């Protein structure tokens, strides 16, 4: 056309998920044929570490961890040459409800990841990189290990890659069931053999991370995105998106929709496009959608929302945030109170125990408020309480997990206070429709 890429554009090119779900996509041979470790060979011989940091920075890539932090500027933080071991970490523990886009990179194009981490590792002078996956992703755990095996066999991982004087090797560390191990800092402690409580994050993992050494951590999708960006430049990448949200994104969608799943679109396409053109439109009437993660404040199912560009800015200024691209639509047949009643009895289960405000605060007081008011036992007073509880937790827990639990509640009051008061005043339990076939 003329300007900027934002949707169903004939000029948009599938990059990451391109080969997912194609027969035998994960073979080292499939990978070598359909493209191969060509880009990494190239760069390891030509561009320097600092150069590759630049090309990644110019692109405007931001952490698809859900954080949204300039992965370019992030690598910038690593020490240059201090004769110290450095580590790269892939965060492949994807435990955010409604968010399942990293799973399939690991299951069907693992070498795509290995390629990116070789790139990244080189950018930061990391000779050792780890992959903390979840202990629940079994196939993803096997395929990723498989691939790391045959990558060493052909010399794509080892003592002197491509004859250049850089060495890169990978290590898979499985989890064992804990949403909190997803947090960059706690993630370390978990792998390290400690109980998984986030650390004091005024001292960042670039100055001290895994075993004290300068480390850097990135999402699976972040790292994978590094490949196409080094292959076809920063300009191809910035050609898609908005003024501040460049590149493509793996938006995923669950809930009641024609065809749920993972959909690679450019950064900036609309909710209307995801839910309808690709996803196929809803199956019930919908009342609200949870835009990014579940850590994200929900928004009402309105025309003005459906026409919002899914970005690190458009949702930002809509009273929410783009999380991990995990969208979930919620039907009118279910109470928004019940919805949060659930989410919060989640953040309760997953809290680590370190803070008073999250432990006692949400996993004690908050879950039990819902409980009461969700069984038709709650007075208007229990709605007021829950309300004034939030600001005592939100600001000042230890890690953002407690934030993640209140933010969504706050929003649900800010838009659906009527469903709460209604259940409280009429001493009414939450409606229990039949939802499973």
């Amino acid at each position: 056309t003329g300007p900027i890429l934002s949707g169903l554009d004939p000029r948009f090119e599938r990059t990451l998920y391109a080969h997912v779900g194609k027969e035998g996509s994960w073979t080292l041979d499939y990978y070598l044929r359909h493209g191969g470790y060509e880009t990494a060979k190239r760069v390891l011989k030509e561009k320097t570490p600092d150069e590759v940091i630049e090309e990644v920075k110019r692109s405007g890539l931001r952490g698809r961890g859900g954080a949204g932090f300039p992965t370019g500027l992030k690598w910038s933080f690593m020490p240059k040459d201090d004769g110290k071991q450095h580590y790269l970490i892939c965060n492949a523990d994807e435990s955010e409800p409604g968010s399942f886009k990293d799973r399939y990179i690991l299951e069907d194009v693992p070498h795509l990841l290995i390629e990116g981490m070789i790139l990244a590792g080189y950018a930061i002078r990391a000779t050792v990189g780890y992959i903390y996956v979840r202990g629940e992703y079994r196939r993803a755990a096997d395929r990723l290990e498989q691939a790391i095996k045959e990558a060493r066999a052909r010399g794509y991982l080892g003592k002197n890659l491509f004859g250049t004087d850089f060495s890169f090797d990978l290590h898979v560390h499985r989890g064992a069931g804990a949403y909190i191990c997803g947090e960059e800092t706690a993630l370390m402690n978990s792998l390290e053999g400690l109980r998984a409580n986030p650390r004091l994050k005024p001292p960042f993992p670039a100055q001290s991370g895994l075993w004290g050494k300068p480390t850097t951590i990135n999402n699976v999708e972040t790292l994978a995105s590094v490949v196409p960006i080094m292959e076809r430049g920063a300009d191809w990448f910035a050609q898609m998106g908005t003024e501040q949200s460049k590149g493509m994104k793996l938006y995923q969608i669950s809930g009641p929709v024609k065809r749920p799943g993972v959909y690679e679109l450019p950064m900036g396409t609309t909710f209307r496009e995801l839910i309808y053109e690709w996803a196929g439109g809803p199956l019930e009437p919908i009342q609200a959608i949870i835009p990014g993660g579940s850590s994200t404040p929900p928004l009402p199912f309105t025309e003005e929302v459906l026409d919002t560009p899914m970005s690190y800015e458009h949702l930002q200024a809509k009273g929410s945030m783009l999380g991990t691209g995990g969208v979930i639509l919620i039907p009118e047949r279910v109470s928004m109170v019940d919805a949060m009643w659930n989410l919060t009895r989640f953040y309760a289960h997953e809290s680590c125990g370190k803070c008073t405000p999250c432990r006692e605060g949400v996993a004690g007081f908050m879950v039990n408020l819902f409980a009461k008011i969700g069984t038709g036992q709650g007075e208007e007073k229990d709605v007021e309480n829950l309300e004034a509880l939030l600001p005592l937790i939100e600001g000042r827990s230890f890690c953002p997990l407690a934030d993640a639990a209140v933010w969504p509640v706050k929003g649900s009051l800010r838009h659906f206070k009527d469903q709460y008061l209604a259940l409280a005043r009429e001493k009414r339990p939450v409606p229990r429709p039949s939802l499973w076939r």
Partner: protein, 238 residues
């Protein structure tokens, strides 16, 4: 030296100083659980929150003063309605799942929690005063359990200030106590039974409550009923 102004009082202080010891050096004061002398400071109990300006540009969230270094020309607010309101909320959250044994608790009147509760609790928002908002079943668990011939653990009482586990790793270096399951279900426990360290008794003095208690002297008298005699030990040369 760095020029910090706590409330209205300005104070000199070396660069490597906590905003906490900053505020205590000034005269003023604040809640205080997890943090201890000679133990690594962390922000776990989240009670020592303060307001901070680094102009008059005030930071958007509250800072745990025990793990924040003073910057030069910094401003610390410990009196604002914003702070107190929080403080009294942190009291509230702690007592949420606490036992209710005060009279019958060896932690007499010598109990940091008891004390702080009456120091900062029960906010005065400006009709009958509401003592307790929480009205559900509390945290019932293992109670009155001797870890050793010298120590007796009360799991219900524990407020999770990380002091004891923290102390064992750092000071003597014998990891004989640590937390167990996660979330609201977590408790203190051992798998080293004997309580093997030759410095186990010291947890008895650090514990802010009456979970960990000197069993040599269970149920002798209340803390104020003792006739304290400051002296020296002559069992060895130290």
């Amino acid at each position: 030296m760095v020029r910090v102004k706590v409330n209205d009082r300005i104070v000199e202080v070396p660069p490597g100083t906590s905003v906490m010891d900053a505020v205590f050096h000034a005269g003023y004061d604040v809640p205080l659980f997890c943090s201890e002398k000679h133990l690594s400071p962390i922000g776990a109990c989240r009670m020592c929150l303060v307001r901070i300006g680094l102009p008059i540009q005030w930071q958007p969230k509250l800072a745990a003063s025990c793990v924040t270094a003073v910057a030069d020309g910094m401003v610390v607010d410990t009196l604002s309605d914003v702070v107190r309101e929080a403080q009294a909320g942190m009291v509230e959250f702690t007592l949420l799942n606490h036992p209710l044994d005060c009279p019958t608790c060896d932690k007499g009147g010598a109990c940091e929690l008891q004390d702080r509760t009456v120091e900062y609790g029960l906010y005065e928002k400006y009709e009958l005063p509401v003592y307790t908002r929480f009205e559900f079943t509390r945290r019932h668990v293992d109670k009155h359990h001797p870890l050793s011939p010298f120590v007796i653990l009360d799991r219900e009482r524990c407020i999770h200030c990380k002091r004891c586990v923290r102390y064992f790793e750092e000071v003597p270096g014998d990891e004989v106590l640590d937390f167990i399951e996660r979330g609201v279900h977590t408790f203190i426990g051992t798998m080293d039974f004997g309580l093997p360290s030759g410095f186990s008794g010291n947890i008895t003095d650090i514990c802010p409550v009456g979970a960990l208690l000197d069993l040599t002297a269970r149920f002798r008298a209340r803390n104020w009923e003792m006739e304290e005699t400051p002296t020296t030990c002559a069992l060895c040369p130290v």
